[PDB]
Enzyme design. Structure first.
Site, short mmCIF file in Angstrom:
data_model
loop_
_atom_site.label_atom_id
_atom_site.label_comp_id
_atom_site.label_asym_id
_atom_site.label_seq_id
_atom_site.Cartn_x
_atom_site.Cartn_y
_atom_site.Cartn_z
N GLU A 124 0.85 -1.19 0.00
CA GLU A 124 0.00 0.00 0.00
C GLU A 124 0.88 1.23 0.00
O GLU A 124 0.54 2.23 -0.66
CB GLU A 124 -0.91 0.09 1.20
CG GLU A 124 -1.78 -1.12 1.48
CD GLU A 124 -2.38 -1.10 2.86
OE1 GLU A 124 -2.13 -0.29 3.72
OE2 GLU A 124 -3.14 -2.07 3.01
N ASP A 153 -7.33 -2.36 -7.01
CA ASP A 153 -7.53 -3.59 -6.18
C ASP A 153 -7.26 -4.80 -7.06
O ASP A 153 -6.44 -5.66 -6.73
CB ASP A 153 -8.85 -3.47 -5.54
CG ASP A 153 -9.36 -4.67 -4.78
OD1 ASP A 153 -8.58 -5.44 -4.27
OD2 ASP A 153 -10.61 -4.75 -4.68
#
Length: 155
Positions: free
Chosen positions: A48, A134
């Site tokens: 991330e 994603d």
């Protein structure tokens, strides 16, 4: 042509550590750049972070950015820890180096050049771009080709 650079990021990982990846969408100049890579052994948090770094490092001049992510680690770092860590010379209360100091210092450098507006999305309510991130992130982790160099079981 957008008057603001738009950045969307996500990261994913199958284990702790395990194979993982990132997806970042960047709308800069008049294009849409997509970044995604898989790493052999890493963590979720690191991916991330890696999402946001790679997108910002693509920015060649000072810009007015708006970054959107549903990542809580980036958020938590950005809103409550980062300010404190610079003041402490990137150390914990026990005088040890912060975890992922390699990525946090690296992202710190990348934001230093820009005007940034952070948009913290809810996983279940991002824009079509967060979802694509994603999906990219997930696909990447299924086929890792890189080594996450700063990873440690450790520090």
């Amino acid at each position: 042509m957008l008057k603001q650079v738009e950045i969307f990021t996500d990261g994913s990982c199958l284990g702790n550590p395990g194979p993982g990846g990132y997806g970042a969408i960047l709308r800069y100049r008049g294009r849409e750049k997509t970044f995604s890579a898989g790493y052999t052994r890493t963590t979720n948090n690191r991916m991330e972070l890696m999402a946001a770094i790679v997108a910002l490092e693509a920015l060649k001049e000072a810009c007015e950015v708006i970054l959107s992510t549903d990542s809580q680690y980036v958020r938590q770092g950005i809103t409550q820890w980062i300010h404190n860590w610079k003041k402490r010379g990137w150390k914990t209360a026990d005088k040890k180096p912060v975890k992922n100091v390699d990525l946090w210092q690296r992202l710190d450098a990348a934001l230093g050049q820009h005007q940034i507006k952070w948009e913290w999305v809810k996983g279940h309510a991002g824009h079509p771009e967060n979802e694509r991130c994603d999906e990219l992130a997930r696909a990447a982790a299924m086929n890792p080709t890189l080594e996450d160099t700063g990873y440690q079981v450790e520090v």
